[PDB]
CSV table of C-alpha atoms and ligand atoms in Angstrom, one decimal:
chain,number,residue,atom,x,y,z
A,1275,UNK,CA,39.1,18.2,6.9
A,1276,UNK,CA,37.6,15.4,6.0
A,1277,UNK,CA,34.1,16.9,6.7
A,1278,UNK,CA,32.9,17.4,3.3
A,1279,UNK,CA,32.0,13.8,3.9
A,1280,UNK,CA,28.7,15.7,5.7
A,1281,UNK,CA,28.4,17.8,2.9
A,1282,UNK,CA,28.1,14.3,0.5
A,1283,UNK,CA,25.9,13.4,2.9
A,1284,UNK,CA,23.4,15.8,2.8
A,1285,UNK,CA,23.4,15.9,-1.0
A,1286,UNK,CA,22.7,12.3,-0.9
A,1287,UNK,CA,19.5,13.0,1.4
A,1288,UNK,CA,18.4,15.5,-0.7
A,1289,UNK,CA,19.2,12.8,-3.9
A,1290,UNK,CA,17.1,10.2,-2.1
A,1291,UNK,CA,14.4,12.5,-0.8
A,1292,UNK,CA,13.4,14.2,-4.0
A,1293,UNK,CA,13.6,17.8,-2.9
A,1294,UNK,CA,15.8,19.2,-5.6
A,1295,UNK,CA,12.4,20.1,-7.0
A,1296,UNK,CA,11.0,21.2,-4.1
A,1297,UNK,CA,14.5,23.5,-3.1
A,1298,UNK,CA,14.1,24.9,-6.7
A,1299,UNK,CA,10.7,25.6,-6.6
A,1300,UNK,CA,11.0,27.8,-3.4
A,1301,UNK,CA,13.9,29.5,-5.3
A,1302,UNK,CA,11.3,30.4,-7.8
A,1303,UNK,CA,8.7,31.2,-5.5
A,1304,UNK,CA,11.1,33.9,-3.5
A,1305,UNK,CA,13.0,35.1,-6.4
A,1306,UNK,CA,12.9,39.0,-5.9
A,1307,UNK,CA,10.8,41.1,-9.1
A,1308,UNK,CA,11.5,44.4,-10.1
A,1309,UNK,CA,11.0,46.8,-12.9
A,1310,UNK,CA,12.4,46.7,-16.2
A,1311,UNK,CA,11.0,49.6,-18.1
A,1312,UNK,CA,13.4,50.4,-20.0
A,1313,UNK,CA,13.7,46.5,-21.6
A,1314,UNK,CA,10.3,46.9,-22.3
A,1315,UNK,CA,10.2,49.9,-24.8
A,1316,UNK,CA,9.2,49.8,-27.7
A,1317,UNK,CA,12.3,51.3,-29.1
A,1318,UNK,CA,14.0,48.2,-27.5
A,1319,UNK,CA,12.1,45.1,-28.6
A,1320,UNK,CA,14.5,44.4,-31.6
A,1321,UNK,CA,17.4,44.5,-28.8
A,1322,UNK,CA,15.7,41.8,-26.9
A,1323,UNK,CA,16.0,38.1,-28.3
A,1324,UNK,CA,13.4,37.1,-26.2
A,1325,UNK,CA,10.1,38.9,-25.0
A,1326,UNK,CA,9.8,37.7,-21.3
A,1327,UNK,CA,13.8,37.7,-20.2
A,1328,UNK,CA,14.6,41.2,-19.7
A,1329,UNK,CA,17.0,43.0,-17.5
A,1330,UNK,CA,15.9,44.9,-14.2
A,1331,UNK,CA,16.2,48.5,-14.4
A,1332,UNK,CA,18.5,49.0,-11.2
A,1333,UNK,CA,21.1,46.7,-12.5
A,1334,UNK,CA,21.1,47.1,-16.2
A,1335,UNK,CA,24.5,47.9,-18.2
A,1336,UNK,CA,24.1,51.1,-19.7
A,1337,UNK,CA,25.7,52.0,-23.1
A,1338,UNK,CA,27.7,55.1,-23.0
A,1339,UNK,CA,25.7,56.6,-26.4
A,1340,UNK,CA,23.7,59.3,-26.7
A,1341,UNK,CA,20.8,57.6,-28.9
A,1342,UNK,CA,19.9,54.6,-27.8
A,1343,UNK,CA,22.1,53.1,-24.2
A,1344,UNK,CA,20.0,50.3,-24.1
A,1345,UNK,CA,21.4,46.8,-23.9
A,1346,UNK,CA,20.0,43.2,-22.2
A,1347,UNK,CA,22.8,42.2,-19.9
A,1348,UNK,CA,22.8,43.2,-16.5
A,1349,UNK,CA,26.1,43.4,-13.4
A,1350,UNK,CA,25.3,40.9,-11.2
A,1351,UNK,CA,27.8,42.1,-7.9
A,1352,UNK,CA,28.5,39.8,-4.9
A,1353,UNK,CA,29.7,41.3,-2.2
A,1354,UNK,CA,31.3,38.5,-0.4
A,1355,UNK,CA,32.5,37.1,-3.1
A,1356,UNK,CA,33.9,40.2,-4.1
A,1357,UNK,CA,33.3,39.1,-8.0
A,1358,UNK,CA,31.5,40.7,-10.6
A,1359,UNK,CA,29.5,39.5,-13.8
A,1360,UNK,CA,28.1,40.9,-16.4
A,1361,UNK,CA,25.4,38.6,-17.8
A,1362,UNK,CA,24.0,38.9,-21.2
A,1363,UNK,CA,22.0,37.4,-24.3
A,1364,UNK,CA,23.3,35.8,-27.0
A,1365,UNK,CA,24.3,39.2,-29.2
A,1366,UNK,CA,21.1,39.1,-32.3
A,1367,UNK,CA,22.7,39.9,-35.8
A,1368,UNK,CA,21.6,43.9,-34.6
A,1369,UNK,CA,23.6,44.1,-31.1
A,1370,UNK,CA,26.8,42.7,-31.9
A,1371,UNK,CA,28.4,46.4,-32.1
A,1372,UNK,CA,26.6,47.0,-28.9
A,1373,UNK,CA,27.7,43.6,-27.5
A,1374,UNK,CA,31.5,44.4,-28.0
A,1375,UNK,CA,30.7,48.2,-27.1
A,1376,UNK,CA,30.0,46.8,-23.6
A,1377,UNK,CA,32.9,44.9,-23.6
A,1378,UNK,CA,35.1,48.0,-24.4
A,1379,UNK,CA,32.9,50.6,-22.5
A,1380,UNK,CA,33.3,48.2,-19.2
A,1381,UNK,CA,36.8,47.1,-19.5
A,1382,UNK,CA,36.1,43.5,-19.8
A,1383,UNK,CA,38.9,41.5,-20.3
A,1384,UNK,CA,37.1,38.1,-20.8
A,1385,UNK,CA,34.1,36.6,-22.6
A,1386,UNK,CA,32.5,33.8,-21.4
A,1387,UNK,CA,30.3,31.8,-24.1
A,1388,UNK,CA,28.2,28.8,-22.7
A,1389,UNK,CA,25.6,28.0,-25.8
A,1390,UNK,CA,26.4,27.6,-29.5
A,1391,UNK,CA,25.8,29.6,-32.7
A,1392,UNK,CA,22.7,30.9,-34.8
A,1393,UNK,CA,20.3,27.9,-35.4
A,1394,UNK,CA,18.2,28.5,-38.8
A,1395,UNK,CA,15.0,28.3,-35.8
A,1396,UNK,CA,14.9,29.6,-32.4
A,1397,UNK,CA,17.4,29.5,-29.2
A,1398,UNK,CA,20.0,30.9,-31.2
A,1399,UNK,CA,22.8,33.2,-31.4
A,1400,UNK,CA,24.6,35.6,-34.1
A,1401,UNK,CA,28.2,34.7,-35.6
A,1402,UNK,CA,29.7,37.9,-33.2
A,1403,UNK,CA,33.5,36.9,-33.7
A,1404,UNK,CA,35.5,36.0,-36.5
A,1405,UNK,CA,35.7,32.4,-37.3
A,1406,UNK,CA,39.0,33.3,-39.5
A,1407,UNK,CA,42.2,35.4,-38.8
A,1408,UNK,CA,41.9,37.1,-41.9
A,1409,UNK,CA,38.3,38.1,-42.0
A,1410,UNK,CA,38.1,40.3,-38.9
A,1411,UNK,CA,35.0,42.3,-38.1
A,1412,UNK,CA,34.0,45.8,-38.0
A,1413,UNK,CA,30.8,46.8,-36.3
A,1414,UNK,CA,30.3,50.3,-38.3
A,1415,UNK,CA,27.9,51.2,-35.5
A,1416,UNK,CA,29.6,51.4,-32.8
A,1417,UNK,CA,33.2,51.7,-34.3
A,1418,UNK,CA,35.2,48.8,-33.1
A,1419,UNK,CA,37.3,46.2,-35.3
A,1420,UNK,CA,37.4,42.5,-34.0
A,1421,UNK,CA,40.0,40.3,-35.0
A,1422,UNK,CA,40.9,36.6,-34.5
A,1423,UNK,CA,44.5,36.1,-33.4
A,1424,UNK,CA,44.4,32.5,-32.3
A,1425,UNK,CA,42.3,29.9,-31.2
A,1426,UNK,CA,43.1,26.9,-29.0
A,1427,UNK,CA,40.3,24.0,-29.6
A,1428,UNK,CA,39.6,21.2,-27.1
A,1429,UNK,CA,36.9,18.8,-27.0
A,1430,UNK,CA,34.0,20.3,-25.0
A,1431,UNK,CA,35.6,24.0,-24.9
A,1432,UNK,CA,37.9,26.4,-27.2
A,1433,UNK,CA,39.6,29.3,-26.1
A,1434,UNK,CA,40.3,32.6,-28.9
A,1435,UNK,CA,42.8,35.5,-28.5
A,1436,UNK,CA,40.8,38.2,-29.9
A,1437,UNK,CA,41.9,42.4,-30.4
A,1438,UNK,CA,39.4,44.5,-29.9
A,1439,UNK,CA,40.1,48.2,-31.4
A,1440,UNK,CA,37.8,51.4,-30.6
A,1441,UNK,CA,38.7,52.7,-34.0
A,1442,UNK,CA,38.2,56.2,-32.8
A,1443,UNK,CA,41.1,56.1,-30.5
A,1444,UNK,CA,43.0,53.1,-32.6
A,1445,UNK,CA,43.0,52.4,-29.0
A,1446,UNK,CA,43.5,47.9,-28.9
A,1447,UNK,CA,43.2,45.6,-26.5
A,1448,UNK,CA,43.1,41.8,-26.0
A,1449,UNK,CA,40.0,40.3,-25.2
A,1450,UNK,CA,40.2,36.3,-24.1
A,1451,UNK,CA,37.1,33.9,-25.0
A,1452,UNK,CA,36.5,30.9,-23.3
A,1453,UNK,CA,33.3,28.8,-25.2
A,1454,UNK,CA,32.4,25.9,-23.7
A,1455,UNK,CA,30.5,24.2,-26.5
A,1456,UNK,CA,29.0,21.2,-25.2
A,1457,UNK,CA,26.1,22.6,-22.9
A,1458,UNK,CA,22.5,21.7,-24.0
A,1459,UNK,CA,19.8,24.2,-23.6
A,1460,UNK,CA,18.0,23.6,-20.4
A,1461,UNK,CA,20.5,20.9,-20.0
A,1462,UNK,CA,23.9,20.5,-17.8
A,1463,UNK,CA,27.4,20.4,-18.9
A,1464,UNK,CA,29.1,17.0,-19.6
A,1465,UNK,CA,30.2,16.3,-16.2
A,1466,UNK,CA,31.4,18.5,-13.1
A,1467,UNK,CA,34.7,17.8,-14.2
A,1468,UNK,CA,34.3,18.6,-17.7
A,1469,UNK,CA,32.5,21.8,-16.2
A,1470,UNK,CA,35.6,22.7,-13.5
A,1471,UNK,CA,38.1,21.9,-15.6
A,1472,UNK,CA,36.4,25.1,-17.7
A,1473,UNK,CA,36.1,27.7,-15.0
A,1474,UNK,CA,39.5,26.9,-13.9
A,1475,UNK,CA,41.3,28.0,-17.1
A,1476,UNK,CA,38.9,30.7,-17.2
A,1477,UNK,CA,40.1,32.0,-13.1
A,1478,UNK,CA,43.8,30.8,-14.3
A,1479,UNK,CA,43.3,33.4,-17.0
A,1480,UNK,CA,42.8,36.3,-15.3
A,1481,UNK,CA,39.7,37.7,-16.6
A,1482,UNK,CA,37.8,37.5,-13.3
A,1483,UNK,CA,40.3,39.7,-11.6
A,1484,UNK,CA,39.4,42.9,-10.0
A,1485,UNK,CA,42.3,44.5,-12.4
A,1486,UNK,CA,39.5,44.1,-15.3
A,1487,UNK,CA,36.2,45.1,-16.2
A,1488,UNK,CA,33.6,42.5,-15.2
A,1489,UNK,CA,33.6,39.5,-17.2
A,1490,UNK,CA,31.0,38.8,-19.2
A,1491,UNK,CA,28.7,35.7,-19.4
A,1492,UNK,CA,26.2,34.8,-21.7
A,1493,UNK,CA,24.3,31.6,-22.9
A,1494,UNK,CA,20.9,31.8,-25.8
A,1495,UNK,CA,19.0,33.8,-23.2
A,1496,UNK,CA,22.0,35.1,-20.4
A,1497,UNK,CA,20.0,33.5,-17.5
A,1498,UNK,CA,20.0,29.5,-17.6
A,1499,UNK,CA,23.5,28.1,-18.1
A,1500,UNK,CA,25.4,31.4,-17.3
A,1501,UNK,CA,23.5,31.6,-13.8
A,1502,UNK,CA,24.8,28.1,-13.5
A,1503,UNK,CA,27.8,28.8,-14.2
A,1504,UNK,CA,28.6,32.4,-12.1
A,1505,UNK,CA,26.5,30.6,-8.9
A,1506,UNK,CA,29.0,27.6,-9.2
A,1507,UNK,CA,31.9,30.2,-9.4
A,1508,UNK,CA,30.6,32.3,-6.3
A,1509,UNK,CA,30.0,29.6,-3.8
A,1510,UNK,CA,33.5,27.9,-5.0
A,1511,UNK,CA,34.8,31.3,-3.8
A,1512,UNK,CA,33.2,31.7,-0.7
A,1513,UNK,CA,33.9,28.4,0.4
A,1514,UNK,CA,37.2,28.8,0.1
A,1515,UNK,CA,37.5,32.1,1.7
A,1516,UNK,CA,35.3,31.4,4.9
A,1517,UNK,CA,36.6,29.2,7.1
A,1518,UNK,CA,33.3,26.8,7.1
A,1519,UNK,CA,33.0,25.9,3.6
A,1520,UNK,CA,30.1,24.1,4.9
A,1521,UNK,CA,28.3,27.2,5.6
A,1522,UNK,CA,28.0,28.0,2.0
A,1523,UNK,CA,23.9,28.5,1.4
A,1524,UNK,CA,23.6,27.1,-2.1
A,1525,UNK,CA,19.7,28.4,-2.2
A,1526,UNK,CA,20.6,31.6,-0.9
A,1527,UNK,CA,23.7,32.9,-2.6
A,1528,UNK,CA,21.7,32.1,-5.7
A,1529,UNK,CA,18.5,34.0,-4.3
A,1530,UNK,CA,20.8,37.0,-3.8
A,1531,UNK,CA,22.1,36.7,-7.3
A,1532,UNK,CA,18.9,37.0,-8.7
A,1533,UNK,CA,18.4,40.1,-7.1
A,1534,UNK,CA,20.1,41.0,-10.0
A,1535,UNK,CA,18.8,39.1,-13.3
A,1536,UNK,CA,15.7,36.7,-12.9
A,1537,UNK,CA,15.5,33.6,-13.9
A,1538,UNK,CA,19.1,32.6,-12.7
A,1539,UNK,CA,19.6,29.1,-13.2
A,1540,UNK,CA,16.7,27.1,-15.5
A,1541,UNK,CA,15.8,23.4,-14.1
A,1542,UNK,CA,16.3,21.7,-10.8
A,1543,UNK,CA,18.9,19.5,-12.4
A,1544,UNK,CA,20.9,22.7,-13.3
A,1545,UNK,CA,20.4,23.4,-9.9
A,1546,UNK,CA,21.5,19.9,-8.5
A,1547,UNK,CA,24.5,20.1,-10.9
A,1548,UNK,CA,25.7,23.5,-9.5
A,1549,UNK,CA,26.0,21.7,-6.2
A,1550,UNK,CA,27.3,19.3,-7.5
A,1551,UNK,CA,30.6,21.0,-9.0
A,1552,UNK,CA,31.1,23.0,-6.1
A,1553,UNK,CA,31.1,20.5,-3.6
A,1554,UNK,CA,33.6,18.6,-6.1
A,1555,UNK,CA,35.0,22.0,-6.9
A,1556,UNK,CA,35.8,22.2,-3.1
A,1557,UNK,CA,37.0,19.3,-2.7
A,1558,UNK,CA,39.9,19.4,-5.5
A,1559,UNK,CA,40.5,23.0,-4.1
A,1560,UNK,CA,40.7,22.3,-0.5
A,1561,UNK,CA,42.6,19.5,-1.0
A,1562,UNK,CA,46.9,18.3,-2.6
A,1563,UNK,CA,46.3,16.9,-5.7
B,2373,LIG,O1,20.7,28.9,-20.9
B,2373,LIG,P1,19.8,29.9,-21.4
B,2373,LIG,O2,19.6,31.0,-20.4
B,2373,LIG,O3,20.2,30.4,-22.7
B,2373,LIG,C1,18.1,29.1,-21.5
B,2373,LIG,F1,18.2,28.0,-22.4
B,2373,LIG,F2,17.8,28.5,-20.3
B,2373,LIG,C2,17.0,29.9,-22.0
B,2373,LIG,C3,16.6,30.0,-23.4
B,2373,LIG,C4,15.5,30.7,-23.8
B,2373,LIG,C5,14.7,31.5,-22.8
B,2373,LIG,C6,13.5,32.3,-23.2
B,2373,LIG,C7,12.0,31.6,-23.2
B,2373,LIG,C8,11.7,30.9,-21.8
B,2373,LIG,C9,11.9,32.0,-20.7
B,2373,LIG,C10,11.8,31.6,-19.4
B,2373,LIG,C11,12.0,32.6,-18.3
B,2373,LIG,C12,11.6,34.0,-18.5
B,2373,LIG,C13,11.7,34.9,-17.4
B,2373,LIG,C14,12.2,34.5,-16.1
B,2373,LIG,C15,12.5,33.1,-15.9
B,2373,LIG,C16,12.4,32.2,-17.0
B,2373,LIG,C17,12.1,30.5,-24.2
B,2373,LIG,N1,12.2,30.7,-25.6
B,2373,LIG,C18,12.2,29.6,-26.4
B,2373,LIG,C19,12.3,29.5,-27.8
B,2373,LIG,C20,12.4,28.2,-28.4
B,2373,LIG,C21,12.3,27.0,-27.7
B,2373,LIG,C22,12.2,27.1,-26.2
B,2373,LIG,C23,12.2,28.4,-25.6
B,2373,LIG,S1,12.1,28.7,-23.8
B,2373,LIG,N2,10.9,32.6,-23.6
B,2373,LIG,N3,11.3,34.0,-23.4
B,2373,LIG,N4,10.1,34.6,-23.8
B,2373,LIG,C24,9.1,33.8,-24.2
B,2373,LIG,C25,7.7,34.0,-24.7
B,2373,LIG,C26,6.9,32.8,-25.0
B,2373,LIG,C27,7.5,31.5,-24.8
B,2373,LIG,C28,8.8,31.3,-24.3
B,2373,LIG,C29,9.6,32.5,-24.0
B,2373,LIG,C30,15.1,31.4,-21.4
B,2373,LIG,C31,16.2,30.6,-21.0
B,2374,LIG,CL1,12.8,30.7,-13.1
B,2375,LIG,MG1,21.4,50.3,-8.0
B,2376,LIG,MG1,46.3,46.8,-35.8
């Protein structure tokens, strides 16, 4: 039980011997490469925000549309786990009808938003929801109305009730975002608690349940914060479903999610801070209170 102590333990080695650097490093070094062709066309470069993050071909979301199916986000599967992600950009003021396309096309039932919205520079994002009940959206493109039915706001997150509407089948549905608004680029949420308190309401919600399409995750880019945040959610879940939480391999469940998207996770503290939360996460989980 009270063996997470070890699990402290080594975290404070690694603390005190410096190798965060070094473990990330030799993430970097092993991460797996494969093509992405079909991010590189020139057809696509006004889909991608950013020239060197592009999806890998063998895990790419497709786009059920004849022209162009083309999107940057790719399913990250854990088999283990048994969870599913879909991990995007931030949608660019031309892919928000294929952004929400996805989200009807896969059956997603939750959005999860890590960064914040289009700066008048770079590492931004497009305005893809409404910000009003009133003003909903319609993405002419690819045929889908957005509204805003509610929105909860907290101090480092807010939550929004959206309906989503395939206006060719006035088919609707309700599509749950969770935006946690207070992670820096490159930088790590406010604390692990801040951070857990987050994914729990997003688990509590539902979204991440085999009933629904895969959520999806994005930051600026789809790769820093949002692998931060799906590795965290992964190793909380197989901790908790093995028997020896302690033989959860940080390093390698996120080697074997970047099997799926590179770049997973952006700076050794991210890193640090991912085991961070779990091992807290654990603890909180595995424990009464
Ligand atoms: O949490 P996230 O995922 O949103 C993030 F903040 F970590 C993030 C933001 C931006 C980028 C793209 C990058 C960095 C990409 C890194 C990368 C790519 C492939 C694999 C692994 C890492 C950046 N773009 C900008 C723009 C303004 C300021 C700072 C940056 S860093 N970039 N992409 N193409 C480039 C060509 C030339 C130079 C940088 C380039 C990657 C990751
Ligand atoms: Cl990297
Ligand atoms: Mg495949
Ligand atoms: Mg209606």
């Amino acid at each position: 039980k009270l063996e997470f102590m070890e699990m402290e333990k080594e975290f404070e080695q690694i603390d005190k011997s410096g190798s965060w650097a070094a473990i990330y490093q030799d993430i970097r070094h092993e991460a797996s490469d494969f093509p992405c062709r079909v991010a590189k066309l020139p057809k696509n470069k006004n889909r991608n925000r950013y020239r060197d993050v592009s999806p890998f071909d063998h895990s790419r979301i497709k786009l059920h549309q004849e022209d162009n199916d083309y999107i940057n986000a790719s399913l990250i599967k854990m088999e283990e786990a048994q969870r599913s992600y879909i991990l995007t950009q931030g949608p660019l003021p031309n892919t928000c009808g294929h952004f929400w396309e996805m989200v009807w096309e896969q059956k997603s039932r939750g959005v999860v938003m890590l960064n914040r919205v289009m700066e008048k520079g770079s590492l931004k994002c497009a305005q893809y929801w409404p910000q009003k009940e009133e003003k909903e959206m319609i993405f002419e493109d690819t045929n889908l109305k957005l509204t805003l039915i509610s929105e909860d706001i907290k101090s480092y997150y807010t939550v929004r009730q959206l309906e989503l509407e395939n206006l060719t089948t006035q088919e609707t549905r309700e599509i749950l975002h969770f935006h946690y608004t207070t992670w820096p680029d490159f930088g790590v949420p406010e604390s692990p608690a801040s951070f857990l308190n987050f994914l729990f309401k997003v688990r509590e919600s539902g979204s991440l349940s085999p009933e629904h399409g895969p959520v999806v995750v994005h930051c600026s880019a789809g790769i820093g914060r949002s692998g931060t945040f799906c590795l965290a959610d992964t190793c909380l879940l197989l901790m908790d479903k093995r028997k020896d939480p302690s033989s959860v391999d940080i390093k390698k469940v996120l080697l074997e999610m970047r099997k799926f998207r590179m770049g997973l996770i952006q700076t050794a503290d991210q890193l640090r801070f991912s085991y961070l939360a779990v091992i807290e996460g654990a603890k909180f989980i595995m424990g009464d209170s």
